[PDB]
Amino acid sequence: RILDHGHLLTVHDPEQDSELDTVILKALVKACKSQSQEAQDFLDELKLAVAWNRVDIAKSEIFSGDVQWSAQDLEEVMMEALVNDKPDFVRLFVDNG
Amino acid sequence: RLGDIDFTGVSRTRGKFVRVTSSTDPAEIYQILTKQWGLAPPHLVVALMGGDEVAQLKPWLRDTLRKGLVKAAQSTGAWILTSGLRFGITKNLGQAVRDHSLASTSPKVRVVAIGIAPWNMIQNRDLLLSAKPDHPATYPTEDLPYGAVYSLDCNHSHFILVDEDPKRPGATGEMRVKMLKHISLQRTGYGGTGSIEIPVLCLLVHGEPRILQKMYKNIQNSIPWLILAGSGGVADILVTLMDRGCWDADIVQELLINTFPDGLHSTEITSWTKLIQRILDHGHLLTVHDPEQDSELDTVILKALVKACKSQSQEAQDFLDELKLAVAWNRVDIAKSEIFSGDVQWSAQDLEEVMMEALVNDKPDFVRLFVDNG
Amino acid sequence: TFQVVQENADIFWKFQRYNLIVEYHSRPALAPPFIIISHITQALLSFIKDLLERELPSGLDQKLMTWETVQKENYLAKLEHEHRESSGERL
Ligand SMILES: [Ca+2]
Ligand SMILES: [Ca+2]
């Protein structure tokens, strides 16, 4: 049954991955994607992505066509990226509405 | 029905227009466009289809699309066909064309944003009804929500306003298809003692199931189509179906329902499924532009036009406009790979005009290619 | 000292030339002693009644701003294209 779920399980190989924040973010994003498609549920994953400077993961998964993002949904994370000096995420948020 | 418009608002812009009916000959409208307005026969016609839905493009996608289209159109004289209403991707494309016109120091080649809009969708149409030859009609610019009635985009220089047809309420699409086909059949004079066709391409961004009939009509008229990968609607359906490689009734209906919840009708969904099935069945007239992967609109446009020409005929005289576009865009690799392969036979007299064009415009790679090819 | 200045001689001289041209562009056309005539004329004109730093009409100003924005976009696009084809990026 555990494997039958699958989407809630991830493998961290320090030989291959060696970056725990990337794997953690990927696992949380996968769980959220399998859970729901609303943008309000991706806000904490987005905050973690901003804090870890994982712009590529956010672009690939969080800001894909599956999830619809509004301008008002991104105001708080825009402020977080601005105050914390994350220009890549500022550019991404401008690009996404 | 020939009238001028003085746009009041941010900037004093001038615009001409012509009211037309659903039964008008596209030849007369082309004649008016060429002689009565002075627009030289274009070297590339890009028709914008879709983008009028409430679901708009993402700012990065919209900016990339408009910038790439304008830069591809800036090399030669190009007409950009949109629904000239101030809304959606049409407004932003008009803004980009306007910005290029302001920033252009070479008025020899021009990018013209020609709008074809319903007469029943123009806000304050009675205001521009006057259209006195001495006094151009004053038209106010108003930004409005999705709604059902817009105002003419001030950044579109020329307009073709088509009245509603009493028989069927689809005059705009039919007029657009007729104009595109008539332009595609045109043959402007080339250099000396020569004539060339006008490359016509259709760009689809976030189509709704309603334009499927017009899209299939344009496909039947052998007009190539370009599809934005992440556009939002029917475009994702088409790109996903091509990515899978096979399209069947079950998968087509599943994707159609998944991306369009509101559409629920057995006969209508069957018609849409069959339409899409035929559209993909053509295939050679369809291309995918993924800004993540391609990111160079001129390359994709040239590849689409060359593919359409190859599937059409093998004569070199039909490849002359594609060759001119390749020369203007410095796409020597595409020309060598496709245009100058063994399939098409090229003569020395066929290449004289393009040789002069490459020589005058400082394209040494194309000069070398033409020397290499006869 | 000579080596340090001579390395940037072109820039230093061009700045000097700018300053000298600006200084003599804003000077009265008459040389002293005669400059008294120019001073008297200027004072009389002030009592009785530019090549650089000019104000533009709104339409021309907006056109110039859009032209400069387009130039900046082209410059940034060329920079991005140069970056993409670099050896490190390809690697
Ligand atoms: Ca979450
Ligand atoms: Ca052709």
Short mmCIF file of N, CA and C in Angstrom, two decimals, chain A residues 94-97, chain B residues 58-61:
data_model
loop_
_atom_site.label_atom_id
_atom_site.label_comp_id
_atom_site.label_asym_id
_atom_site.label_seq_id
_atom_site.Cartn_x
_atom_site.Cartn_y
_atom_site.Cartn_z
N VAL A 94 6.84 38.90 -11.58
CA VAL A 94 6.44 39.85 -12.61
C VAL A 94 6.01 39.12 -13.88
N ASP A 95 6.77 38.09 -14.26
CA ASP A 95 6.44 37.28 -15.43
C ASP A 95 5.12 36.55 -15.28
N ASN A 96 4.69 36.26 -14.05
CA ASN A 96 3.51 35.44 -13.82
C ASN A 96 2.31 36.24 -13.31
N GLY A 97 2.28 37.55 -13.54
CA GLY A 97 1.06 38.29 -13.31
C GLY A 97 1.15 39.53 -12.45
N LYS B 58 0.08 34.95 -19.96
CA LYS B 58 0.97 35.40 -18.90
C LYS B 58 1.85 36.53 -19.44
N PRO B 59 2.23 37.49 -18.58
CA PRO B 59 3.02 38.63 -19.07
C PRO B 59 4.30 38.24 -19.79
N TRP B 60 5.02 37.23 -19.31
CA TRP B 60 6.23 36.81 -20.01
C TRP B 60 5.89 36.23 -21.38
N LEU B 61 4.85 35.40 -21.45
CA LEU B 61 4.45 34.81 -22.73
C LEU B 61 3.95 35.88 -23.69
#
